[PDB]
Amino acid sequence: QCVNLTTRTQLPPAYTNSFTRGVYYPDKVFRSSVLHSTQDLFLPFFSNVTWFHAIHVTKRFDNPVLPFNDGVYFASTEKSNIIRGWIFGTTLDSKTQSLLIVNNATNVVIKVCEFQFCNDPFLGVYYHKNNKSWMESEFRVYSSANNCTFEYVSQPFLMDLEGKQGNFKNLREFVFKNIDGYFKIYSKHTPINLVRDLPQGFSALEPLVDLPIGINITRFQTLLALHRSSGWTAGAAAYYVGYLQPRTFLLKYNENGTITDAVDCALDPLSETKCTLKSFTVEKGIY
Amino acid sequence: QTSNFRVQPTESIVRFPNITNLCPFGEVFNATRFASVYAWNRKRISNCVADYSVLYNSASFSTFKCYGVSPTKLNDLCFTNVYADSFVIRGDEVRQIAPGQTGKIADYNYKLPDDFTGCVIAWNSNNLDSKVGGNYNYLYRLFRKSNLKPFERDISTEIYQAGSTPCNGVEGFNCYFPLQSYGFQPTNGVGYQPYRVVVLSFELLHAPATVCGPKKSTNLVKNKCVNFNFNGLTGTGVLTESNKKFLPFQQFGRDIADTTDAVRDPQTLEILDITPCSFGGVSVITPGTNTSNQVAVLY
Ligand SMILES: *[C@@H]1O[C@H](CO)[C@@H](O[C@@H]2O[C@H](CO)[C@@H](O[C@@H]3O[C@H](CO)[C@@H](O)[C@H](O[C@H]4O[C@H](CO)[C@@H](O)[C@H](O)[C@@H]4O)[C@@H]3O)[C@H](O)[C@H]2NC(C)=O)[C@H](O)[C@H]1NC(C)=O
Numbered sequence: 001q002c003v004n005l006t007t008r009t010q011l012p013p014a015y016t017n018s019f020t021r022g023v024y025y026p027d028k029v030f031r032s033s034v035l036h037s038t039q040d041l042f043l044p045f046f047s048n049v050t051w052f053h054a055i056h057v058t059k060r061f062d063n064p065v066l067p068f069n070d071g072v073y074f075a076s077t078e079k080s081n082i083i084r085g086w087i088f089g090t091t092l093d094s095k096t097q098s099l100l101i102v103n104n105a106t107n108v109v110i111k112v113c114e115f116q117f118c119n120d121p122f123l124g125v126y127y128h129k130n131n132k133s134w135m136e137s138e139f140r141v142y143s144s145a146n147n148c149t150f151e152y153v154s155q156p157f158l159m160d161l162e163g164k165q166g167n168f169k170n171l172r173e174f175v176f177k178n179i180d181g182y183f184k185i186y187s188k189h190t191p192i193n194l195v196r197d198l199p200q201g202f203s204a205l206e207p208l209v210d211l212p213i214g215i216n217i218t219r220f221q222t223l224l225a226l227h228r229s230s231g232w233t234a235g236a237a238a239y240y241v242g243y244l245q246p247r248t249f250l251l252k253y254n255e256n257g258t259i260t261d262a263v264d265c266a267l268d269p270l271s272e273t274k275c276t277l278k279s280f281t282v283e284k285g286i287y
Numbered sequence: 288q289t290s291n292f293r294v295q296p297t298e299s300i301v302r303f304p305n306i307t308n309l310c311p312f313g314e315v316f317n318a319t320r321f322a323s324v325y326a327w328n329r330k331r332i333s334n335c336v337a338d339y340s341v342l343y344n345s346a347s348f349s350t351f352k353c354y355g356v357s358p359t360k361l362n363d364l365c366f367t368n369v370y371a372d373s374f375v376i377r378g379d380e381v382r383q384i385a386p387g388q389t390g391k392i393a394d395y396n397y398k399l400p401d402d403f404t405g406c407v408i409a410w411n412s413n414n415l416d417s418k419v420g421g422n423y424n425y426l427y428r429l430f431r432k433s434n435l436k437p438f439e440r441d442i443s444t445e446i447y448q449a450g451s452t453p454c455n456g457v458e459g460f461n462c463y464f465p466l467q468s469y470g471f472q473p474t475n476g477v478g479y480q481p482y483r484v485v486v487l488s489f490e491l492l493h494a495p496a497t498v499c500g501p502k503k504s505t506n507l508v509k510n511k512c513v514n515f516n517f518n519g520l521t522g523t524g525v526l527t528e529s530n531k532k533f534l535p536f537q538q539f540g541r542d543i544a545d546t547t548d549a550v551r552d553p554q555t556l557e558i559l560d561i562t563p564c565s566f567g568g569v570s571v572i573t574p575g576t577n578t579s580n581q582v583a584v585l586y
């Protein structure tokens with residue numbers, strides 16, 4: 001069943017700067033104390049990424065449509081995990097194959113079918129009175145499925161769902177790419193207790209799983225949790241989206257096989273010099 | 288300096304991933320409830336590595352009928368999708384499963400096109416089929432007014448009218464009637480001895496093609512210059528035990544020279560080592576042929 005939300009506040013999107021974030025292992029090769037350089041799809045250092053706010057204030061909501069470039073970097077700041085899942089496709093009207101990934105209190109679903117999506121897909125969790133528990137009472141993301149190719153159910157995941165207004169408890173970083181009919185997802189989960197201005201430091205994104213699909217993807221749309229207790233209690237969750245470009249990076253593997261540093265070879269000419277000598281320290285002279 | 292010296296490999300260990308998970312396709316072949324020829328069954332199965340040597344040596348299959356595809360090479364082939372079916376064909380109509388025929392249900396029910404690989408196999412059915420009295424629930428086509436085409440479905444849930452007489456709930460002399468029943472005669476010849484048949488179709492199209500076949504795995508050897516054929520990697524060397532700590536997802540191992548030197552075991556998840564096996568140059572030492580005729584060899 002398809003519905004829509006009314007009486008919502010609209011706000012312009014903001015911009016924020018990526019402070020050397022978005023590094024992931026491009027290969028499955030172990031290295032020890034090496035300065036290997038590679039040219040792949042990456043997120044350039046020190047650039048705008050757009051910022052959408054899902055604050056409850058008054059009655060503000062956000063769920064826009066963003067085109068899918070060659071790669072997507074999704075950085076969510078969460079306290080009670082309001083954000084749940086994503087949908088990928090071109091038309092999103094059951095006329096073409098489309099992917100849907102959700103991880104709810106029930107079993108995790110990764111399903112590439114034809115779904116008749118609604119104008120405002122969402123998930124609705126009700127705060128019942130007979131027991132003080134939150135259970136999913138509204139599945140209105142799409143109408144129905146017709147005929148499919150690849151459906152997968154992962155292990156069930158249990159996580160408390162509440163509408164809170166506190167500081168973000170954790171950060172979830174995801175990188176989505178689509179090459180050679182393969183959908184590759186790189187995931188990382190980190191703890192922090194900040195409010196904005198994403199922390200410094202380098203955090204490599206380990207790969208999670210690869211999905212063989214082989215479909216066009218030019219548009220993606222995320223979905224939230226619409227709690228019930230008219231009223232929706234959207235919370236104050238935040239998520240950032242960024243796009244990837246072909247860039248050459250210099251990676252420094254430690255003794256354990258874990259990436260600890262990287263240098264973008266498109267920044268100020270000092271970075272170019274560091275990218276030529278294959279070292280992080282350059283002495284005086286002319287190069 | 289005289290020549291060079293090299294050590295040849297002996298074994299060809301071919302270790303692959305651990306185990307195939309499952310493929311319930313055999314269950315599709317081996318259930319208890321099935322429809323008739325009127326049901327153009329089409330069961331699509333993908334992302335499943337399935338055993339094929341079982342069908343070549345099974346219990347009561349016998350009538351193995353594949354078309355112009357080599358029988359042996361298809362077990363170790365990898366495709367994108369497979370299709371299934373099940374119904375009763377009444378003995379001699381085994382001839383109708385051919386690449387192009389129109390005499391009978393070869394085109395009436397479960398139409399098969401020409402140049403369609405579709406390995407087909409049937410078996411004798413004397414207890415499930417040819418039952419006592421006759422289970423007339425099964426139906427076969429009367430005339431097939433659908434006028435099918437290669438790879439089409441004949442679904443005629445209505446009745447004929449020739450040119451004059453409507454037959455909408457009225458006994459029409461020219462309106463004929465729906466599909467005739469199935470004469471499961473108790474004990475008779477091939478003309479009254481039904482058979483149950485199943486077809487396995489293949490199609491590649493353009494996809495990642497994650498429907499592969501089973502692969503073997505030989506035991507490993509250590510401390511011996513042998514030929515190794517790990518997943519993707521093919522080479523020669525001596526495999527021993529190392530002490531490097533790998534990440535829970537990395538599989539390969541490289542160095543500054545970008546040459547593979549450590550392989551993770553796909554079965555037991557153990558980190559090995561790679562080293563060339565004792566190549567060198569041989570040289571002789573002589574005190575001068577005038578004084579004596581003795582030599583010493585330096586390796
Ligand atoms: C890939 O498939 C193989 C084949 O099934 C599988 O190997 C077997 O795994 C099971 C567990 O899944 C092993 O069972 C136990 O394994 C533990 C840990 O390896 C062993 O320590 C146990 O055996 C010990 O105790 C025995 C009795 O005291 C001793 O006789 C023995 O030597 C050990 O000390 C126990 O068997 C099973 O042993 C292995 N079999 C072999 C031949 O390795 C493997 O686990 C699968 N791997 C993956 C990643 O799927």
Ligand SMILES: *[C@@H]1O[C@H](CO)[C@@H](O[C@@H]2O[C@H](CO)[C@@H](O)[C@H](O)[C@H]2NC(C)=O)[C@H](O)[C@H]1NC(C)=O
Nearest residue numbers: 253254255256257258259260530531532533534
């Ligand atoms: C890299 O791996 C090594 C593995 O040895 C880690 O070394 C550990 O160091 C701490 C320091 O007190 C010891 O208590 C541990 O016992 C060591 N590990 C082992 C297995 O003995 C090291 O921490 C890892 N990380 C880095 C950055 O070197």
Ligand SMILES: *[C@@H]1O[C@H](CO)[C@@H](O[C@@H]2O[C@H](CO)[C@@H](O)[C@H](O)[C@H]2NC(C)=O)[C@H](O)[C@H]1NC(C)=O
Nearest residue numbers: 312313314315316317318341342344345346347
């Ligand atoms: C169909 O089901 C029958 C059950 O009677 C299977 O017959 C035996 O099944 C077991 C278990 O797989 C095998 O170990 C035996 O070898 C089978 N008997 C014979 C004579 O082969 C039969 O294998 C099943 N057919 C399938 C699974 O294709």
Ligand SMILES: *[C@@H]1O[C@H](CO)[C@@H](O)[C@H](O)[C@H]1NC(C)=O
Nearest residue numbers: 015016017018046047048049
């Ligand atoms: C992001 O916004 C615009 C680009 O359109 C630019 O003026 C601004 O400087 C950018 N941000 C930073 C930190 O440079």
Ligand SMILES: *[C@@H]1O[C@H](CO)[C@@H](O)[C@H](O)[C@H]1NC(C)=O
Nearest residue numbers: 094095096114146147148331
């Ligand atoms: C799948 O769904 C579409 C939409 O109705 C339909 O046109 C198509 O024939 C179906 N089957 C296949 C194999 O694509």
Ligand SMILES: *[C@@H]1O[C@H](CO)[C@@H](O)[C@H](O)[C@H]1NC(C)=O
Nearest residue numbers: 090096097213214215216217
């Ligand atoms: C995906 O887009 C390419 C670009 O033209 C097209 O050639 C291909 O047919 C598309 N695949 C589909 C629609 O499955």
Ligand SMILES: *[C@@H]1O[C@H](CO)[C@@H](O)[C@H](O)[C@H]1NC(C)=O
Nearest residue numbers: 573574575576577578579580
């Ligand atoms: C070999 O050595 C002896 C040592 O006395 C010498 O007399 C002789 O001439 C040598 N041979 C030749 C061919 O010079």
